[PDB]
Amino acid sequence: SLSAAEADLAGKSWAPVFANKNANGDAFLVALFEKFPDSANFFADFKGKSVADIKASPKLRDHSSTIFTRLNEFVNNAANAGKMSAMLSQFAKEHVGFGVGSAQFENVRSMFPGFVASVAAPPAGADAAWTKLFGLIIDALKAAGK
Ligand code: HEM
């Protein structure tokens, strides 16, 4: 889990992103697919399509809102080590179930702070909080197999 200070920083930098949830979730998933294009092959709905077809698919919103809803839950429970511990091992089992491993979350981790900051300049220290949150997810995936 994150410390109280990291959780607070993550929460503050996430609020303006989540306030325009639908559009920012779509733009997140599109940014992830543009510059890690094999990410799209893990999704049955997107496998084989170019990013232009994904941008126009109505399934974009389904997957992006699901991601932002559960990311929101992680952010607001981040400093609760027992809740975090159970959420992470949910999350890891579900993703290993779809063939997703830690390498894919290393990719998310590398772009996430820059995505958040392009919606709104975050307080100082917010990237390291986000980096640590994804490192917990990456660890849980490794612990669950890959
Ligand atoms: C960015 C952080 C992410 C969060 C918070 C997240 C969250 C979720 C959630 C809540 C689900 C639905 C689970 C269920 O219904 O059982 C899901 C499904 C899925 N996720 Fe993730 N996800 C993230 C990143 C990724 C990444 C990076 C990949 C692969 C590159 C991925 C691949 C998938 C796939 C393939 C599914 C199943 C889609 C379907 O067929 O409905 N997710 N994700």
Number of structural domains found in the chain: 1
Q: Are 17 and 71 within 8 A, CB to CB?
A: no
Cα-to-centroid distance, 107 and ligand 1 (Å): 14
Establish whether residue 98 lines the binding site of ligand 1, counting it when its CB lies within 6 angstroms of any ligand atom: yes
CA distance 33 to 105: 13
Return the CATH number at 129: 1.10.490.10
Give the residue numbers spanning the domain of 17.
Answer: 1-146
What is the resolution in angstroms?
2.0
Nearest CA to ligand 1 atom 4: 67
Query: Rounded to the nearest 10 degrees, how much is the dihedral formed by the CA atoms of 8, 9, 12, 16?
Result: -140
Q: How was this structure determined?
A: X-ray
Counting every residue, how long is the chain? 146
Those residues with Cβ within 8 angstroms of residue 106's Cβ, 6 or more apart along the chain or in another chain: 138
Cα-to-centroid distance, 124 and ligand 1 (Å): 29
